[PDB]
Design a protein around this ligand. Sequence first.
Ligand SMILES: *[C@@H]1O[C@H](CO)[C@@H](O[C@@H]2O[C@H](CO)[C@@H](O)[C@H](O)[C@H]2NC(C)=O)[C@H](O)[C@H]1NC(C)=O
Lengths: 48, 47
Amino acid sequence: YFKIYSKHTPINLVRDLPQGFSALEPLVDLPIGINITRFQTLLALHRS
Amino acid sequence: FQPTNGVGYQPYRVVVLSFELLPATVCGPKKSTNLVKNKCVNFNFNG
Ligand SMILES: *[C@@H]1O[C@H](CO)[C@@H](O[C@@H]2O[C@H](CO)[C@@H](O)[C@H](O)[C@H]2NC(C)=O)[C@H](O)[C@H]1NC(C)=O
């Protein structure tokens, strides 16, 4: 089972991992049944 | 196949359903009942 917990918060910082406390609520529990050992992120870029 | 086919030669549709298990994803209907309150009741809520 692939479990994803999530949380969203409004902040007004410039560069830091803000302190404080915030418990993440479960978002989804997908029945995938695969072997995960590596992962990567996907960003967006601007063009014109 | 023709409309006047015999019973043996008449067309037949066949579907074979094979169940593969090795987290199970497709389960049974899991019927339910009505809710009663204010009585000593044996209850089952999602296991
Ligand atoms: C998930 O896949 C990885 C593949 O990198 C497995 O890691 C290998 O597992 C085999 C056993 O089958 C070992 O012989 C290798 O030495 C392992 N390689 C590394 C880099 O660790 C991992 O075992 C798999 N996970 C599960 C639960 O099977």
